[PDB]
Write an enzyme that holds these catalytic residues in place. Sequence first.
Site, short mmCIF file in Angstrom:
data_model
loop_
_atom_site.label_atom_id
_atom_site.label_comp_id
_atom_site.label_asym_id
_atom_site.label_seq_id
_atom_site.Cartn_x
_atom_site.Cartn_y
_atom_site.Cartn_z
N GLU A 35 0.84 -1.19 0.00
CA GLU A 35 0.00 0.00 0.00
C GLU A 35 0.89 1.25 0.00
O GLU A 35 0.64 2.19 -0.75
CB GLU A 35 -0.92 0.04 1.23
CG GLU A 35 -2.16 -0.86 1.16
CD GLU A 35 -3.11 -0.46 0.05
OE1 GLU A 35 -2.95 0.64 -0.51
OE2 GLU A 35 -4.03 -1.25 -0.25
N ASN A 46 -6.86 10.14 -5.71
CA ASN A 46 -7.69 9.29 -6.54
C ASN A 46 -8.41 10.20 -7.53
O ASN A 46 -8.45 11.41 -7.34
CB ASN A 46 -8.69 8.52 -5.68
CG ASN A 46 -8.01 7.56 -4.73
OD1 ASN A 46 -7.23 6.71 -5.14
ND2 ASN A 46 -8.31 7.69 -3.44
N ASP A 48 -11.52 10.37 -8.03
CA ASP A 48 -12.85 10.73 -7.57
C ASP A 48 -12.81 11.91 -6.61
O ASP A 48 -13.82 12.28 -6.02
CB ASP A 48 -13.53 9.53 -6.91
CG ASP A 48 -12.77 9.01 -5.70
OD1 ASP A 48 -11.56 9.31 -5.58
OD2 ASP A 48 -13.39 8.30 -4.88
N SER A 50 -10.81 12.02 -3.92
CA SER A 50 -10.37 11.57 -2.60
C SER A 50 -8.88 11.30 -2.63
O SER A 50 -8.27 11.26 -3.70
CB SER A 50 -11.11 10.29 -2.20
OG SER A 50 -10.66 9.18 -2.97
N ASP A 52 -5.64 8.86 -0.60
CA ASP A 52 -5.29 7.79 0.34
C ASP A 52 -4.09 8.26 1.16
O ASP A 52 -3.10 8.72 0.59
CB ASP A 52 -4.94 6.50 -0.41
CG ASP A 52 -6.10 5.96 -1.20
OD1 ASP A 52 -7.25 6.07 -0.72
OD2 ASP A 52 -5.87 5.42 -2.30
N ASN A 59 -8.45 6.04 3.03
CA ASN A 59 -9.17 6.96 2.14
C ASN A 59 -9.95 8.10 2.80
O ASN A 59 -10.68 7.90 3.77
CB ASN A 59 -10.11 6.13 1.25
CG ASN A 59 -10.77 6.95 0.17
OD1 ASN A 59 -11.92 7.38 0.31
ND2 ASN A 59 -10.04 7.19 -0.92
N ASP A 101 -15.48 -3.32 8.90
CA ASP A 101 -16.57 -2.67 8.17
C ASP A 101 -17.32 -3.54 7.16
O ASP A 101 -18.01 -3.02 6.28
CB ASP A 101 -16.05 -1.39 7.48
CG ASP A 101 -17.15 -0.36 7.23
OD1 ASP A 101 -17.98 -0.13 8.14
OD2 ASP A 101 -17.18 0.23 6.14
#
EC number: 3.2.1.17
Length: 129
Positions: A35, A46, A48, A50, A52, A59, A101
Amino acid sequence: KVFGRCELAAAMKRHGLDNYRGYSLGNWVCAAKFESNFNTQATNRNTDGSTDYGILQINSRWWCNDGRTPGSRNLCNIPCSALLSSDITASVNCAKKIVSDGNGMNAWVAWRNRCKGTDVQAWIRGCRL
């Protein structure tokens, strides 16, 4: 900060990640390697809107607030910048919530693509844990 492999393993085991929710320490060290390559300052924007953040690439769309992610939630109740510290406490506590989650460690795409189903115990080799 860039953690040595065993150095991070120790830090993670110290924060209770070994076997957390059934995921061996190796899974976490492996997720961290792919990662962010053990870099606490790692960041990836990202498409969109967002971003990380940190060693476990958490995120901003749902887990932390960076003030520039539309329709963002802050379920971990912390500024994304806190995920860029040399101390991984914040990332670990937030990670603990994410893994619970409903998707297990599948929440981390790099873990899914490069750790899932593999011999993750090798990521703990040479570590006096």
